Design a protein around this nucleic acid. Structure first.
Ligand SMILES: [Zn+2]
Length: 263
DNA sequence: GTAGACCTGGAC
DNA sequence: GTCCAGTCTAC
């Protein structure tokens, strides 16, 4: 789950929960709760509060209640669904919010990597994990200049730079690989080796790629999966030149690229 | 930069 | 049986 997928969840989930009041909060895997550390305090404070809105910051979902804000990160497999509280739960359900109208919001996560933090609204943006996030890619706050200031000071791979949420917030393995192919830049090259022209081109493709993915409802692996040039296509012909797509390891992640179209 | 952690189930 | 799928620590 990257920005496009999280933004899709935010849009579809909002009307299904806005205006409902919390009656109970049940937790089956405590490690997911990060703040307050004590699961009992986490549950108690939300009882009686009403859902007023749902926003997104980077790859995080921000549930807006009365006094508090619930900050949730899905990591690799987290997912949400709304259903009747009278039916048996599905496998791997670790947290459930029960509403006064008999419906409930369920959180499932097979690998158990997800996290949840609760803070008073006016403290959320000034505390971890939101405090140190970079700017939103689809906002004027993200420009070629911002990307250069960070790139010109480090020799780490350009892919490692784009995956750093403090540089820009929202890109993950799929959209970093896709943006670099569109820009014609190899993922393993030093960020400082990029020319001014290459930085402007990369910025342009990053905004175009992420924006297009949001419109298509994200990648299901949504319909953006039908528009991928390299992710998951190792061994198949490049859609632009016909050369076989390759896969290696960069910045500790599986990496896909075309040896002819990219640097 | 690069294995090891946190964790579980599918593909070969 | 062995390999593969967002972020933190540790040498
Ligand atoms: Zn190509």
């Amino acid at each position: 789950p990257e920005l496009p997928e999280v933004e899709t969840i935010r849009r579809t989930l909002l009307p299904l929960i806005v205006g409902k009041t919390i009656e109970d909060v049940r937790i089956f895997w405590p490690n997911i709760i990060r703040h307050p550390r004590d699961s009992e305090a986490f549950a108690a404070r939300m009882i009686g509060q009403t859902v007023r809105g749902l926003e997104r910051r980077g790859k995080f979902l921000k549930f807006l209640l009365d006094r508090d804000a619930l900050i949730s990160h899905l990591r690799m497999e987290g997912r949400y669904a709304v259903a009747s509280a009278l039916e048996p739960l599905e496998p791997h359900t670790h947290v459930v919010f029960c509403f006064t109208d008999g419906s409930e919001l369920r959180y499932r996560d097979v690998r158990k990597f997800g996290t949840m933090h609760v803070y008073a609204k006016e403290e959320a943006d000034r505390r971890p994990p939101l405090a140190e996030l970079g700017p939103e890619p689809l906002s004027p706050a993200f420009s070629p200049a911002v990307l250069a200031e960070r790139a010109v000071k480090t020799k780490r791979s350009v892919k490692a730079l784009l995956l750093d949420q403090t540089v820009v917030a929202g890109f993950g393995n799929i959209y970093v690989d896709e943006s670099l192919f569109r820009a014609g830049i190899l993922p393993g090259r030093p960020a400082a080796s990029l020319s001014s022209k290459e930085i402007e081109r990369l910025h342009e493709e990053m905004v175009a790629t992420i924006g297009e993915a949001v419109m298509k409802g994200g990648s299901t692996v949504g319909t953006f999966q039908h528009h991928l040039y390299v992710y998951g296509r190792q061994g198949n012909p490049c859609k632009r030149c016909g050369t076989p797509i390759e896969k290696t390891v960069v910045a500790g992640r599986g990496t896909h690229y075309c040896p002819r179209c990219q640097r």
